[model samples]
Target chain A: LRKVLISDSLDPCCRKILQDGGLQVVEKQNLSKEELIAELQDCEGLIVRSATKVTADVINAAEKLQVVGRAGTGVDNVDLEAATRKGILVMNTPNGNSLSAAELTCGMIMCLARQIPQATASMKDGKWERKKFMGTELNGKTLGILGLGRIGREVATRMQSFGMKTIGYDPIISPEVSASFGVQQLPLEEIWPLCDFITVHTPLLPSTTGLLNDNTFAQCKKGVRVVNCARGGIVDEGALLRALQSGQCAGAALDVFTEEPPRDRALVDHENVISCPHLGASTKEAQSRCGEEIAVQFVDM
Target chain B: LRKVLISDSLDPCCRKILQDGGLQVVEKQNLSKEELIAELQDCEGLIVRSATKVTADVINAAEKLQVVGRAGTGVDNVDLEAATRKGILVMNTPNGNSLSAAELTCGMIMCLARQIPQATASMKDGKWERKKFMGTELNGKTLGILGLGRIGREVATRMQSFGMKTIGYDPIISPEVSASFGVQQLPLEEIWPLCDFITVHTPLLPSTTGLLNDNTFAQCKKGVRVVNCARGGIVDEGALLRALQSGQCAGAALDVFTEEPPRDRALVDHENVISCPHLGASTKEAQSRCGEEIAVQFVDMV
Candidate 1:
C-alpha cells in the first residue's frame, strides 16, 4: 500500500478516507525544515497547506515521493520546478475555496458600503452616531469584477441580486460567455470609469501584479471603492493610500495584503479601510472540503 | 396658497419638490414641544421624520393642518388617533426604505455568519487570529424568516441566491404567496428547530412583541444565531441574553432596540452581539427616495 504524509493541519476526514482506501496515512504538523525533509524520506504522497514550505531541497531529498498535493489553492509554497524535474506529480484542490473566497469578497463589499465594522466599533464604545455613519445603498450601483473566474462569477451572481450592475474585464473569458452569466464584459478602460466598486479575483502574475495602481485609480471615477481578496501585491498599497487620502478612493476592503501580517500599518490604520488577516478561505466548511477533496484525489489516483 | 412646514431634518429634495409644486415651504428643524405646536398653528401641511412628536395638543390647535406626511416609515412618532379624529390626512413612505432595510438585514446576517465585524475589530487591534474567527458559510444552511412582508421577502430572495434554504412564517402572507418568491412557508412550531439562523421582520404589536422569548429560545436548535432589523421588542432582550449566556444562541445582530441608545447596555456589551444604531433606513439613497416620494404624495393631493 502507498503511504501518505499530511505535513500540515487538515480535517480528520482526510486520514479516514485514505485509511479506508487502504493507504497508510501519517499526520505531522508544524514541522521544522530538517524535520520535514526527514519525515518525507519514505512517503509516496505528501499533502500540505500554505504553512508548509515544500522547498527544492525537501523535494529533491524525498526519493520515494511520487505526488505533492496541496489541500488548498495557490501552490506557490510548493517547489513546482523541482517536482517537475523529478517527474513527481503536483496536485491542488482549486475549486474547494472558490465559494468561500467569493463569499468573503461579497461580505467585504457590503461592509465597505454600510461601514458595518466601523459602526460596530462605534457601538461598542457606547456612542450612537447614526448621522456620522450614513451609508450608501448598493442598489443601482455598478460592480466591476477584475477576473471572471469561478470566485468572480459567484460574487457577480450574488451581488446582482442586490441590484448591482455587474461588469468585468477578463481577456481569457469571451464576451458572449461572460454575458450569458449576466456579466457585461468590457474593456479595461471602459470598466474603469463606470464602476462604483471594484473587486479583483485573479491570480498573481506579472500582468496582474499592481493591477489597481495610481494610474488605474486616476482613470476610475472619483470616490470609487475597491476590494482585494484574491492575492497580495495585486493592488499597489501605496497608490491605494494616496487615492484614499486624495478622496479619489472612498473606501477599501483588504483580506490579503502585500505582506501577511503587514508590517507597515498605514493602510490598515486608515479609517475608511476594513481589513481581515487573509481569511478568504478561513471557514470550517471550506477547510473540510479542501481536506477531504485532496484525500479523495489521492485515493482515486 | 397652501403652506407646508418641514419640522425635521430631511433631504433637500423634500423642500424643492414641495416648492416646485407651488406650495409655500417653511423649513424649521429641531423645534421644542412648545415651538413645534406654535409652528403648526398656521401651516396647512406638516412634514416630519421620527424627531417630531405630533401630539393631540398640537393637532387640535392647528385649525389649518390638513395633512401630516412622514418622509419615512413608522408613524409611531405622530398621534394617529388624533389625526383621524381631526380629519387630517396621515401619509408615510413605507416602500422607500424596504430595500435599504432588507440590505442591512442581509449584511447583518453575513456579519453573524462570518464574524466579519469581530474579525475587522481584531485586525484593527493588530492581531492575526485567523483560527479564533473561523466562520460558517451560508451555503446549505436553513434561514428562518419570521415575517414574509416586503423587507422579509427581499431578504429571502437575496439570501436564497447565497444558497440558503429560506423557510418563513407570516399569518398575513399566505403560503402560496411566499412560495412564489422561493420561501417555503412553515408553522412557527415546525420552524423553531429547523433553522440554523432566525430573523424577525415583523412590527412590535401585542402578539408579536417578545415573539422570540425564553419559550421560543428553548425550542430553537442549540447554537442558533438571530438577527433583528425590524421594530424593537419583537425579540425579548432578556431571553436573548440568557440564551447567549447558555450557548443556546450562538450570536445576534441587532439594528433596533426597545429604547434608542439603550441604557442597560448588557446585550450591546455582549461579545457575540453586533449592534448598529438603527441604521436600517439611514442610507442616503433611501432618505432621498423617501423625501421625494412624500413631497410628491402631498403635492399631488393638493
Candidate 2:
C-alpha cells in the first residue's frame, strides 16, 4: 500500500476517500520544516494547503514521493521545479473554489465602496459618524477585472447586476470568451485608466506578480479602488502603499497579502484599506469542495 | 416671492434650483428645536432630510407654510398628521434613492453572511484568525425580503444574480407584480420558517413597526440572519438581541436604529450585530439625485 501524508488541514473527507481507495493515509498539521522533511521520507504522496512550504529541500528529502496534491488553487507554495525534477506529479484543485474566491472579491469591493468595516468599527466605539463615511455607489461605475478566468467571469456577472460595466484583460482567455460573459476584453493599459474599481483574479507568477506596480498605479484613474482576493504580490504592496499615501488609490480590500500575517502594519492599518486573513477560499462550501475534489484526484491516481 | 427654509443638509443644487425658480430660500442647518420653529415663522415652504422634526407645534407656528418636502424617503421625522391637518403638502423623493438603498441592503446582507466587518476589525487588531471567521456562501441560500416595493424589488433582482432564491411579502404590491421581478410572493408566516436571511424594507407604521418581534423571531429558522436598511424599529432591537443571544438568530446588519444614535448599547455592542449610523442613502449619487429631484418637484409646484 502506498502511504500518503496529509501535511496540512483539509476536510476529513480527503482522508476518508484515500483510505477507502486502499491507501494508507497519515494526517498531520503544523509540522516544522525539519519535521516535514522527516515525515516525507516514508510517504509516496503528500497533500497540503498554503501553510505547508513544499520547499526544494523537503522535495529532495522525499525518496518515494510520487505526487504532491494541493487541496485548493495556487500551488505557489510548492517547489514546482523540484517536484518536476524528482518526477513527482504536482496537482491542484483549480476549479473547486472559484465561486468562493469571486464572492469574497465582490464582498471586498462592496466593503471598500461603502466603508462597511469602518462604519461598523465606529458603531462599536459608540459613535454615529454618518457624514464621515460618505460612500460611492457602484451603479454606473466601471469595474476592471485583471484576469477573465472562472473567478473573474463570476465577479463580472455578479457586479454587472449592480449596474457596473465590466472590462478585463487576460493573456490566455480570448476576447470572444470574455465578452460572452459581459466583460469587455481590453488591453491592460486601456483597462487601468478606465476602471473605477479594479480587482485581480490572475494567479501569481513572475510575469503577473507586482502587476499593479508604480507604473500601473500611475496609469490608473485617480482614486481608483482595488480588490485582491486572487493572490498576494499581484498588486505591489510598496507601490500600493505609495499610491494610497498619494491619494491615487483611494481604497483597497486585501484578502491576501504578500506575506501571510504581514508583519508590516502600514497597509493593513491604513484607514482606507479593509483586509481579511486570506479568506478568499475560506468559506464552508469552498473547503468541502476542495477537499472532495482533491481526494477524488488522489483516489483516481 | 414665497420664502422656503432649507433645513438640515441638502446639496447646493437644491438651493440653486429654488433661487433659479425665483423663490426666497433660507438655508439653515443644525438648528435647535426652538430655532427651527422660529425659522419657519415667515417661510411658505420647507425642505429637510431626516433631522428636522415638523411637529404640530412648528406646523401651528408656521402661519404661511404651504409645503414640506422631504429630500429622501421616510416621513417619520416629519409629523405627517400635523402637516395634513394644517393643509400643508408633504412630498418625498421616493424613486431618487431607491437604487442606493437597495444596494446598501445587498451590501449589508453580504456583510452578515461573510462577516466582513468582524473579520476586518480582527485584521485591524493585528491578528489572522482565519479559522475563526468561516463564512456561509450566499449562493443557494434563501433570502426573504419583507417588502416588494422599488427597493425590495431591486434587491431581489441583484441577489438573484448571486443565485439566491428571493421570496418576499408586500401588502400593497400584487403577487403578479412581484412575480414579474422573479420574487416569489409568500405569506409572512410561511416566510419566517423557510428563509435563511430576512431583510425588512417596509415603512415604519403601527402594523409594520416591531414586525420581527419575539413571536416572529421564534417562528424563524434557527440561525437565521437578518438585515434592516429601511426604517428603524421594523426589527425589534431587544428581540433581535435575545435571538442573537439564544443562537436562534445568527447575525444582523442594521443601517438604522429605532432611536437615531440608539441610546441603548446592548444591541449595538453585541458581537453578532453590525450596526451603521443610518447610511442606506448616504451615497453621493443618492444625495445628488434627491437634491435635484426635490428641487425639480418644488420648481414644478411654483
Candidate 3:
C-alpha cells in the first residue's frame, strides 16, 4: 500500500477516504524541512494546509513522492518550482472555500453599513451610544464587484436579491455572461464613480497590484465604502488610509491585509477601518471540503 | 396662524415644511411637564418623538390641540387613550422607518450567525483569535419571521436574497399578499420547529406580549438564533437568558429591552446576547423620512 503523509492537520474525513482507498496515512503536524525531507523517502503523496511549508529542499529530497496536495487554495506554501522540476503533481482545492469566502464578503459589507464591530465593542464597554452607529440601508444601493469570479458571482446573486444593483469590471468574463449573473459589466473607470460599496475578489497580479490606490480613490465616488477579502497588495494601504481620512472612502472592512498582522498601525487603527486577521477561508465547512477534496485529488492523481 | 408645539427634537427640514405651510412653530427640548402643559395650552398641534412623555395630564392641558403626531412609529411615550378621548388624532409615519428597521434586523441576524459582535469585540481588544471566531453561513438556512408586517416583509425580501429560505407567521396579512413576497406563510407552531433563525417584528400588543416566552422557546429547535427589533415586551428576557444558557436558543440580538439601561445585568452580561440601545428608527434617512412624514400629516391636516 502507498503511504500518504499528511504533514499538517486536516479533517479526519480526509484520512478516512485515503485510508479507505488502501493508502497508509501518517498525520504529523509542524514537521520541519529536515524532518519532512527524511520522512518523504517512504511517502508517495503529501497533503498540507497553509501551516506546513513544502519547501524546494523537501521537494528535492522527496524521490518517492509523486503528488503534493494543498488542502486549500493558493499553493503559496508549496514549492511549485521544485515539484514541477521533480515531475510531481501539485494540486489544490480551489472551489472548496468559495462559499465560505463569499459569505465573509457579505458579512464585511454589512459591517461597513452598520458599524457593527464598532457598535459591538461600545456596547460591551457598557455604554449605550445608539446615535453614533446610525447606519444606511443596503436596499437600492450600488454594489461594485472588481472580479466576476466564482466568489464574485455569488456576492452579486445574493446582494442583488436584497434590491441592490450590481455593476462590476472583469477582463476575462464577457459582458453577456456578466449580464446573465445580473451584473452590469462596466469599465474600471465607470465602476469607481457609481458604486456605493466596492469589494475586490481578484487575484494579486502585477497589473492588479495597487488597483485601489491614490488614482482610483480620487475617481471613486465620495464616501464610497470598500471591502477587500481578496488580497492585501491589491489595495494600497497608505492610499486607503488617506481616503478614509478625507472621507473619500466612508469605511473599509479588510480581512486580508498587504501584510498579515499588518505593520502599519495607522491603517489598522483607523476609526472607520474594520480589520480581521486573514479569515477569508477560515470556516469549518471550508476546512472539511478542502481537506476531503485534496484527499480525493491524491487518489485520482 | 395656528401654533404647533415641537415638544421633542425634530429635524430642521420638518420644521421648515410645517412653518412654510402656515403654522407657528415652537421648538423646545426636554421641557418639564409643567412647562410642556403651559406651552401646550394654546397649540393646535403637538409633535413629539420617543423622548418626551405626552401624558394624560399634558393631553388634557392641550385644550386647543387637534393632533398629536408621533414623529416615529411607536406611541409608547404618548397616552393614546387621553388623546383619543379628547378627540385628538395620534398620527405616526408607519412606513418612514421600515427600511432602516429592516436593515438593522438583517444586520443583527448576520451578527448572530457569525458571532460578529463577540468576534468584533475580541478583535478590538487586540487579540487575533481567528479559529475562536469560526462562523456558520447564512446560505440555505431557514429564517423564521415572527411578524410579516411592513418591517418584517422588508426583512423577508432582503434576507431571501442571501440564499436563506424565509418561513413566517403573521396573522393579519393575507396568504396571497405574503406569497407574493416569496414567504412561505407557516403557523407559529410550525415556524418554531422549522427555523434556523427567528426574528420578531410584531408590535407590543397584548397578544404579542411575551411572544417568545419559555413555552415558545421550549417548542423551538435547539441552537436556533433569534433577533428582536420590534419591542422589549415581545420577547421574555428572563426566558431568553435561560434559553441561551441552556443552549436551547443559540444566540440573540436585542435592540429594545424591557428596561432601557437595563437593571438586569445577568441577561445583558451574557456572551451570546448582543444588546443595542433601541436604534431601529435612528438612521439619518429614517429621521428625515419620519420628520417629513409627520410634518406632512399635520400640514395637510391644516
Top model number, lDDT: 1
lDDT of each: 0.92, 0.91, 0.85
Interface RMSD of 3: 1.9
Residues B1-302, candidate 2: write the lDDT tens digits. 37889998888999999889998889999998899888888988999998888888889998999999999986878899998899999999988899989988888888888898998999999999997988888899999999888899999999998999999899999889999999998878999999999999898889998999999999999999999999889999899999999999999999998788899999889999997898888998899889889888888999
Which ranges of candidate 1 are over 4 A from the true structure? A12-39, A50-61, A74-90, A296-301
- Determine which window of 10 residues in candidate 3 chain B has minimal summed lDDT: B116-125
Sort by TM-score, best first. 1, 2, 3
Tell me each candidate's i-RMS in Å: 0.8, 0.7, 1.9
Q: A-chain TM-score in candidate 1?
A: 0.88
Give lDDT tens digits, candidate 1, residues B108-175: 98889888888888989988888677888999999999999999999999999899999999999999
lDDT of 3 by residue, B58-105 (tens): 888878988989988878898989988999889998799998888888
**In candidate 1 chain A, where is summed lDDT lowest over 10 consecutive residues?**
A33-42
Candidate 1 residue pairs in clash (backbone atoms < 3 Å): none
lDDT, candidate 1, at A133: 84
CAPRI grade of model 3: medium
What's the TM-score of every candidate structure? 0.94, 0.91, 0.90
For model 2, the superposed segments whose C-alpha errors exceed 4 Å read: A1-44, A48-63, A74-85, A296-301, B19-22, B32-42
Candidate 1, residues A120-152: lDDT per residue as tens digits? Answer: 999999999998889999989999999998999
Better by lDDT, candidate 3 or 2: 2
User: What local lDDT does model 3 show for residue A30?
Assistant: 89
Off by over 4 Å in 3: A1-44, A50-58, A74-89, A292-301, B16-42, B174-177
